[PDB]
Amino acid sequence: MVKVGGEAGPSVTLPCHYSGAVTSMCWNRGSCSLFTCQNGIVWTNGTHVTYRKDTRYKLLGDLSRRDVSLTIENTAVSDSGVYCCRVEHRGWFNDMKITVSLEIVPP
Ligand code: NA
């Protein structure tokens, strides 16, 4: 599990990188599970973000180099929780899933 966090306010980045050919991914707000981002907050098509639930959610890394790290701007305590970085592959069982814990503490 990846552990990140900080005091509420400043941005935090949830690191996520994958291997192989460029492919689509989504971020889940919640633990990783069987199905693709059931509480999805960001979706990509491999090269671009196609949808985000909140404008605070940004992918500021180089997607073409498989850096799909999520930055949350203007963090709040309520952002705390488990997130899933899910990189989509062609099987049923072979998606790459990284679990990230986010801890945003009160100032
Ligand atoms: Na991968």
Numbering used by the authors: 4 to 110
Paper text:
TIM family proteins exhibit a classical type I membrane protein structure with an N-terminal immunoglobulin variable Ig-like (Ig V) domain, a heavily O-linked-glycosylated mucin-like domain (MLD) and a short C-terminal cytoplasmic tail. Recent studies indicate that hTIM-1, with some other but not all phosphatidylserine (PS) binding receptors, functions as a common attachment factor for a range of enveloped viruses, including filoviruses, flaviviruses, HIV, etc., through direct interaction with PS of the viral envelope. The Ig V domains of hTIM-1 and hTIM-4, exhibit two antiparallel β sheets with the front and back faces formed by A, G, F, C, C′, C″ and B, E, D strands respectively. A hydrophobic cleft formed by CC’ and FG loops, located at an equivalent position in hTIM-1 and hTIM-4 structures represents the putative PS ligand binding site.
We crystallized the Ig V domains of hTIM-1 and hTIM-4 and determined the structures at a resolution of 1.3 Å and 2.3 Å, respectively, using the molecular replacement method. While hTIM-1 has only one molecule in the asymmetric unit, there are eight molecules of essentially the same structure present in the asymmetric unit of hTIM-4. Despite sharing overall structural similarities with other Ig V domains of TIM family proteins, hTIM-1 Ig V domain exhibits unique features that may be essential for its distinct biological roles. Most notably, hTIM-1 possesses a significantly short BC loop that is the most variable structural feature amongst Ig V domains of the TIM family. In addition the residues of BC loop carry smaller side chains when compared to other TIM family proteins. This structural feature coupled with the movement of FG loop of hTIM-1 away from the BC loop, creates a unique groove that merges with the PS binding cleft. Two residues (Arg 110 and Arg 86) in hTIM-1 (while the counterparts are Pro and Gly, respectively in other TIM family members) render the two walls of the groove positively charged. We show that the Ig V domain of hTIM-1, but not other TIM family members, interacts directly with the GP and more specifically with the RBD of EBOV in vitro. In addition, the single mutations R86/A86 and R110/A110, exhibiting 60% and 50% reduction, respectively, in the binding affinity of hTIM-1 to Ebola GP, confirmed the structural interpretation that the unique groove in hTIM-1 also participates in GP binding. Based on the above results, we conclude that all the three loops, BC, CC’ and FG, of hTIM-1 together constitute the binding sites to Ebola GP, of which the residues Arg 106, Trp 112, Phe 113, Asn 114, Asp 115 and Lys 117 are critically important for Ebola GP binding, while, the residues Arg 86, Arg 110 have moderate effects on GP binding. Additionally, we further identified a number of residues on these three loops, which are critical for the EBOV GP binding.
